[PDB]
Structure 1
Amino acid sequence: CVHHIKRRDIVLKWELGEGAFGKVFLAECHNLLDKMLVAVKALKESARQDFQREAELLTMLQHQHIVRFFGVCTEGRPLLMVFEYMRHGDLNRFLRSHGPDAKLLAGGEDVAPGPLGLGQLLAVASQVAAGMVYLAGLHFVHRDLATRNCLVGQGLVVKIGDFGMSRDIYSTDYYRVRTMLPIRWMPPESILYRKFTTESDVWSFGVVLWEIFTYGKQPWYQLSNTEAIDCITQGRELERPRACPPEVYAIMRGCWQREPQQRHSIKDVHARLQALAQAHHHH
């Protein structure tokens, strides 16, 4: 069911990054019905089994807020996976680039440098929630939802992926125990017993909300991985960000209920973020 692309149509431009399993390139692609920019993942490695499984999954996950997969290229080696190109890169760097120090960090020609406002922060939040509502419905558990696993494209379009580049670029966001876990986004049951569910993803979503309203700060930045593990298991909650309205904090607190069945459903979270976004559109 996977779509196939001819290797002659893929025109490599430059390596964007390197994951453990592959290399990512910025490329030019002809006929995706004509010089369209794409993100091509080239497989390093048996693994031909994993490549097929992933390609079939990516072929099935099609949504407005899920990074677009356009197909594979089995004609030769390396094996290629073609995805849409999102100009603004990962959402953590984007938030960091459009925060309190945006004027200092901006290039001469950059358009209206300055922090993103409430409406924008809410527009990003609502779109991430929408992509998570889709996954929940398909009984799909992300496991690594964080701003680094989100992409931004022109016109503040925000989409969810799961990147191997994110594990490299943001290696500090993972803890070894070899399985690298994103402990700072995980609820206690996941840290304690590796219990990943839609309810652990809604917890991660609350942590993602905190990242949006702190403009990219690391959850528990003041703490070491072991101090963060004990804070999370003890039941400590992330302090309200200064840029965070109280009602948005109530949403986070909904996502962080100690018991997984007590946590707010992603649909309710989405409906509320959309309601707030809608109430600030003209003001």
Structure 2
Amino acid sequence: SSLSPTDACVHHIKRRDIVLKWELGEGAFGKVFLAECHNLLPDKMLVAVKALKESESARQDFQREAELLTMLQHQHIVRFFGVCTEGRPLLMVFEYMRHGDLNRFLRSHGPDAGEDVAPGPLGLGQLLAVASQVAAGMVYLAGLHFVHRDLATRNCLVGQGLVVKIGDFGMSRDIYSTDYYRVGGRTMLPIRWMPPESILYRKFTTESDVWSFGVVLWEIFTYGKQPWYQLSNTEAIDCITQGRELERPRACPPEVYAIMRGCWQREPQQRHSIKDVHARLQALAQAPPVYLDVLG
């Protein structure tokens, strides 16, 4: 549902092939469970199962969503294995990402907090690796002419070996309620991540995702701090619309902050494409230690 453009293709899994272990989370629209899935990939593997709460309006939304998720298959997009429409509750099966959402991962590996990562805070090299993988996922989405209306570290997942992918199970509005401004009665906007054209003109395009990516880049270098944390929602709207930009994170080199600033050009057409933003961050991620040591 987070995607905006500009039933046979959907894979099906038998309910007996899914063995629920325990809950991982919950929202107003459903629950997420860790489960064992048999005969999915050649014997048994762990998966995250999203159970849809209750209905014919939601069932067609489920069908459209599964079709969209089937289309969206790439190295930095959370893997969607298919559905179980064999009775109720309707289930969506995703790969299991051991470290959970990227916001929680960053916070737990920040100065205010060992199989996959070293002790203490994440180094410059790993923060650049995290940013580059999120940018790669957006390059793929932009390439398919898709707009992600809620790009943020809470909407990214981290797996074994610090593999980062864009994806969520629709519970961010419940889990991270303060990251949204209620305009209601049932609408919540992620204003802190939204560009001026979204707030002022209610327009959201591929260029608006470049802005949101710039905010994601800032979350990463602040170890998951909320953008404009010092401000109420209306104060945040005032800053974004007046042109006040997020300040350089302590852990962020001037070279990386230059990438954030390029994402935050008031005029959409003036912002660099996600392709160029990814190219620059990837170069920095795979740059020799000698070069990286003199940046940070």
Measured against the shorter chain, the TM-score band is: over 0.9
Structure 2 counterpart SS, 1:231: helix
Could you report, residue by residue, the CA deviation over 1:213-240 in whole angstroms, capped at 9, with x for unpaired residues? Answer: 0111000000111111101100000000
Name segments (4+ residues, structure 1) moved above 2 Å.
107-113
Which of the residues 46, 49, 52 maps onto 2:60? Answer: 49
Report the Cα distance in structure 1 between the residues aligned to 2:57 and 2:218, rounded to whole angstroms: 40
1:174 to 2:183 alignment: no
Q: Give the superposition deviation at 1:261.
A: 0.6
Q: Give the superposition deviation at 1:163.
A: 3.4
Contact 1:20 1:164 in 2 (8 A): no
Q: Give the superposition deviation at 1:193.
A: 2.4
Inter-CA distance 111–147: structure 2 relative to 1 (3 Å threshold): closer
TM-score by length of 2: 0.90
Q: Give the superposition deviation at 1:16.
A: 1.2
Inter-CA distance 108–212: structure 2 relative to 1 (3 Å threshold): closer
Which of the residues 68, 88, 101 maps onto 1:77? Answer: 88
Contact 1:18 1:164 in 2 (8 A): no
Contact 1:144 1:162 in 2 (8 A): no
Report the Cα distance in structure 1 between the residues aligned to 2:59 and 2:256, rounded to whole angstroms: 44
Aligned to 1:134: 140
Inter-CA distance 257–267: structure 2 relative to 1 (3 Å threshold): same
Report the Cα distance in structure 2 between the residues aligned to 1:219 and 1:121, rounded to whole angstroms: 17
Could you report, residue by residue, the CA deviation over 1:219-273 in whole angstroms, capped at 9, with x for unpaired residues? Answer: 0000111111101100000000010010100000000000001001000000000
Between the two proteins, the alignment pairs up a number of residues equal to: 274
Q: Give the superposition deviation at 1:194.
A: 2.0
Q: Give the superposition deviation at 1:108.
A: 10
After superposing the two structures, state which structure 1 stretch, 230-239 or 34-43, moved more.
34-43
Aligned to 1:245: 253
Report the Cα distance in structure 2 between the residues aligned to 1:256 and 1:151, rounded to whole angstroms: 24
Structure 2 portions without partners, runs of 5+: 1-8, 288-296
Report the Cα distance in structure 2 between the residues aligned to 1:174 and 1:109, rounded to whole angstroms: 34
Report the Cα distance in structure 2 between the residues aligned to 1:129 and 1:108, rounded to whole angstroms: 26
CA RMSD, Structure 1 to Structure 2 (Å): 1.6
Structure 1 portions without partners, runs of 5+: 102-106
After superposing the two structures, state which structure 1 stretch, 26-35 or 208-217, moved more.
26-35
Q: Between the two proteins, what is the percent identity of the paired residues?
A: 100
Contact 1:99 1:215 in 2 (8 A): yes
Could you report, residue by residue, the CA deviation over 1:126-183 in whole angstroms, capped at 9, with x for unpaired residues? Answer: 0000000000000000010000000001111000014322221101100011310000
